[PDB]
Amino acid sequence: SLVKLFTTNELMRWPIVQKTYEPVLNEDDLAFGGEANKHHWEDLQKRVIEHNLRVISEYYSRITLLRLNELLDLTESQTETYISDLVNQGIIYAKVNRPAKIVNFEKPKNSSQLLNEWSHNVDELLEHIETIGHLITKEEIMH
C-alpha cells in the first residue's frame, strides 16, 4: 500500500499521509523507529512535495503562484525556496514571478522543437496510409 501510492501520479498532501502511515511504519525499525530514528523519518516530507511539484510541471503548464502554495500547504517563503532547489537539481524547469503573477513550467519553446516534431509527424502519416492499404487487400478475400 506504501509503494503503490508514490508510483501513481495522483498527488497527495503531506499532513495526512503523515497521519496514515504513522501508527504502522514508525513501529518498525531502520529509517523510521524510535527517537534517533525520528531525525531520518523527517525527510519523507521533503520527498512528498518534490513528487507533487514534479507531477504539477507535467500537467500544469501555467499555474498561479498563490495556488501552487495552497496545494503544497506551505507559506510563500518556503514554497519559493523549494522551487529554486528543484531547478538547480535539474528535476524541473521553472520560471517564477515574485510580484505574485505566474509560475510557468512550460517548455521553453525553441525553433528546433517546432520543426523536429513536424518532421516526425509527417513520416508517421505516410506510414499509416501504407498500413491501411495492406489490410483492404485482406478484406476482399474475407468477403
Binding site: 501520479n9 495522483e10 500537467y59
Partner: protein
C-alpha cells in the same frame, strides 16, 4: 491424485502405440483442478504458485486446445472474486468468454452468476468505458428480463449518457444492498463523473475547453474540476495540459472510440478533398520546368 499418477504411467506406453499424440494435455487439466480444490478450502497460498507454473508451461506451447486454457481461466476467475479485486477479474472474465468452449455443458446458472460479477467489476473499474460493448455479448445480451439484470443494466446505460440524475437515485438504494459498492464508494462516485467528462470532450473536437463547460456538465465546484482533469490525464484516456491562469484545459489528443456509421461517411468526405490536393499539385509542377526531368 489417483487419476494424476494413472495418466502419467499410461501415457508412456500409449504414446508409442498411437505413434504420435500429445498427452501432456491431460496432465495440465488435472493440475488446474487441484489448484481449484485449494481455493474452496481457502488456502490461497498453495493455489497461487500452481496458477503461476500453469500459465508458463501452457504459453510455451505454440498450439493449445480451447479446453485447457478455458479450465485455467476459470480457476483464475474464482480466485480474483474471492479476494475482492474488481480490477483483476474484469481482465480474466473477458478472456474466458473469448476462449469459451462450444460445449453447452456450461449451465445457465454458471452464466448468470458470472454475468453478475462482470457488471459489478465494471462499476468499480479502473479503465472500463466499454460498457456497451460488453452488453452486446450472449452472457448479458439475453439475460435482461430478469429482475437482477434490470436495475443493473440500467446503471450501465446511465453511464453511457452520463445522466447524473438517474444515477443518483439508483445508487442510493443499491449502495446498502450490495456491500461491495459500500466499501468501493469513492470509485463508483468518481466513475459517473468521469464517464460524463469523456462524453463532453469527444464531441467538441476543438482544442480547448473552459473549466465552465466541465463545471456545468458534472455539476461540481471548480475546486474539484481541476482534479478530475488530473485524473483523466493519469488514466491516459486523455493527454494535454492545464492552464490555471485562464482556467482552460487544452486537450491535444483524443483516444479512439467505437466508430459509428455516420463517421464512416465523415472520413470519406475529407479523404476526397486531400486526394485533390495531391492531384492538383503534381500536375502543375510537371508543367513548371518541364525541360529537365532526367
Amino acid at each position: 491424485d489417483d487419476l494424476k499418477a494413472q495418466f502419467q504411467e499410461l501415457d508412456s506406453k500409449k504414446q508409442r502405440n498411437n505413434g504420435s499424440k500429445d498427452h501432456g494435455d491431460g496432465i495440465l487439466l488435472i493440475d488446474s483442478e487441484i489448484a481449484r480444490t485449494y481455493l474452496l478450502k481457502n488456502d490461497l497460498v498453495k493455489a497461487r504458485d500452481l496458477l503461476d507454473d500453469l500459465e508458463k508451461t501452457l504459453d510455451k506451447k505454440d498450439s493449445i486446445p480451447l479446453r485447457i486454457t478455458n479450465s485455467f481461466y476459470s480457476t483464475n476467475s474464482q480466485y480474483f472474486k474471492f479476494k475482492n479485486d474488481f480490477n483483476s477479474f474484469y481482465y480474466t472474465s473477458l478472456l474466458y468468454l473469448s476462449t469459451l468452449e462450444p460445449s453447452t455443458s456450461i449451465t445457465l446458472a454458471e452464466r448468470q452468476q458470472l454475468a453478475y460479477d462482470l457488471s459489478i467489476s465494471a462499476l468499480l473499474g479502473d479503465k472500463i468505458y466499454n460498457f456497451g460493448e460488453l452488453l452486446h455479448h450472449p452472457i448479458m445480451e439475453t439475460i435482461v428480463n430478469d429482475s437482477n439484470y434490470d436495475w443493473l443494466f440500467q446503471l450501465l446505460n446511465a453511464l453511457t449518457v452520463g445522466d447524473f440524475d438517474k444515477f443518483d437515485s439508483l445508487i442510493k438504494v443499491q449502495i446498502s444492498k450490495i456491500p461491495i459498492l459500500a466499501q468501493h464508494e469513492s470509485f463508483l462516485r468518481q466513475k459517473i463523473c468521469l464517464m460524463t467528462l469523456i462524453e463532453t470532450v469527444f464531441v467538441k473536437n476543438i482544442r480547448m475547453l473552459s473549466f465552465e463547460d466541465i463545471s456545468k456538465a458534472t455539476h461540481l465546484p471548480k475546486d474539484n474540476v481541476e482534479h478530475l482533469v488530473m485524473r483523466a490525464i493519469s488514466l491516459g484516456l486523455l493527454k494535454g495540459s492545464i492552464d490555471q491562469v485562464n482556467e482552460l484545459v487544452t486537450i491535444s489528443w483524443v483516444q479512439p472510440r467505437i466508430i459509428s456509421g455516420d463517421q464512416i461517411t465523415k472520413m470519406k468526405d475529407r479523404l476526397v478533398e486531400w486526394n485533390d490536393q495531391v492531384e492538383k499539385l503534381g500536375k502543375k509542377m510537371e508543367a513548371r520546368g518541364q525541360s529537365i526531368w532526367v
